[PDB]
Amino acid sequence: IPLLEGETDNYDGVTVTMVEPMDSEVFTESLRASLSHWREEGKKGIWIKLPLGLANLVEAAVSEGFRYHHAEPEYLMLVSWISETPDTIPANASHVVGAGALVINKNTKEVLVVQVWKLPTGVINEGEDIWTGVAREVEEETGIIADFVEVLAFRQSHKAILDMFFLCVLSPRSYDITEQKSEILQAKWMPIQEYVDQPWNKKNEMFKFMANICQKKCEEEYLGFAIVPTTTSSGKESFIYCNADHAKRLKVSRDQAS
Amino acid sequence: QIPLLEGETDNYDGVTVTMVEPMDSEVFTESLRASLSHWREEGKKGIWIKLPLGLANLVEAAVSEGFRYHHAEPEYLMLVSWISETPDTIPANASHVVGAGALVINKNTKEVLVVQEDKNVWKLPTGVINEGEDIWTGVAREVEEETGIIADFVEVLAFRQSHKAILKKKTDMFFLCVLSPRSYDITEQKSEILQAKWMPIQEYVDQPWNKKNEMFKFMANICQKKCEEEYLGFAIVPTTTSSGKESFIYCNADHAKRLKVSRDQASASL
């Protein structure tokens, strides 16, 4: 009876990417055989990637002692330690990234707010850059276009019942908000002092600190992190967010001699 | 009779169902379809089903009714479905792998802790930051686990988003951090690294790979500048949010110093 196709690594593990439908009775028996031939071989650490359409398989896997590792929509990652060596299966090291947009009209010291008023926030997609992501959210929410300047602050949060947050400052290229930009979304330009003094004022130390940081950048006294564009070991893009002045110094220093 | 699943109601027109007892999958289907209908009428927007590992016989049933995976811990699967006509509000679980590097400076002779295990012979101590784990705690953990050295987090010098090995839409997240060492004695560790030593910053910088490609050249340059005590990064100031009370904001180190000064000098209100 046939084994499962497994792809190996130099951590002694194996990841089975389940791609085509299969009867559950067949899967458990084909898995039980595979578990036997993996304990004889390099034994420890087996991963089953189970896509949403193959949800008819998760019980079969779990019944065989697999547990959950992490999930995206359209795939579930399951894992098992099949060695008698101490279970050292690494926990998930992926995080959900969100971004907060501070869009400053530097001319009027005013900021773009949304539905009581808040900064436009969203999440950074898989494969998306923070600087790209934060701008898209502004455009999706208010219709206005704005370029990314700096990252003012970031934070983490949990107990997570339902994450990483980057506060970014954006520079607007347009000022007209469109009606109606989104369903149950509403927007206006607000003076910075009104935003800081808003009904939360002293609600908690965290919102108050983030607001004060927003204000210091509105007064042009806050040095955040700016981007230095670069490339990885492959041809692929990369961006270093570092001290704004050093970011300039590094970016400027890229020019041509006599 | 509507077989209605017990759920808890949030304030954003959502219901969370936590399944705790075994249920026949057919019965669950019937009960879930009924529930989804009542909720739709009741005005509910986001429906969350939390299925423990041992109740995995229900997973397919939930999925069949339009539920998709949201989050999984070893012991449970959290599933979501949006049942309202309005635009879907739930955050997608779009994740990035998160890493940290430790620049551990010996302030006496401008040396840093290095290990042999990116394509440098001697890299900084680096690892992944677990989901749920503070960067400032995780980077220090990696130091201890690899070298035995107890080191304190001072600043985030830089963070990096890369796109990955032609595979797909994926992007990395990596935090370079600077840490102050308590001891200078490297103990042999039950760890994947082959060896660690102290290495003069200049020799680390002048390594072929750090000289060869631009990205590591910039990271290495940042590290060298912080050794010259001329780099300002993002330091930490701790806060409390309302519902969970343990939180950290990484912000400009001079502002972090100012906010900490003002808060400490505000405790004097006695």
Swiss-Prot record, chain B:
pH dependence: Optimum pH is 8.5.
UniProt keyword annotations, A-Z: Cell membrane, Cytoplasm, Hydrolase, Magnesium, Membrane, Metal-binding, NAD, Nucleus
Span of domain Nudix hydrolase: 95-221
Protein name per Swiss-Prot or TrEMBL: Nudix hydrolase 7
Compartment(s) of residence: Nucleus; Cytoplasm; Cell membrane
Gene expressing this chain: NUDT7
Motif Nudix box in this chain: 127-148
Residues where Mg(2+) binds: E142, E146
Function as written in the Swiss-Prot or TrEMBL entry: Mediates the hydrolysis of some nucleoside diphosphate derivatives. Can use both NADH and ADP-ribose as substrates, but not 8-oxo-dGTP, cyclic ADP-ribose, GDP-mannose, UDP-glucose, ATP, or GTP. Exerts negative control of EDS1 signaling.
Family in the record: Belongs to the Nudix hydrolase family.
Enzyme class, spelled out: hydrolase
Organism field: Arabidopsis thaliana
Expression (tissue specificity): Expressed in stems, leaves, roots, flowers and siliques.
Temperature dependence: Optimum temperature is 50 degrees Celsius.
Pfam family membership, one: NUDIX
Regulation: Not inhibited by fluoride.
UniProt induction comment: Rapid and transient induction by biotic and abiotic stresses. Not induced by H(2)O(2).
Keyword check for NAD: yes
Cofactor dependency: Mg(2+)
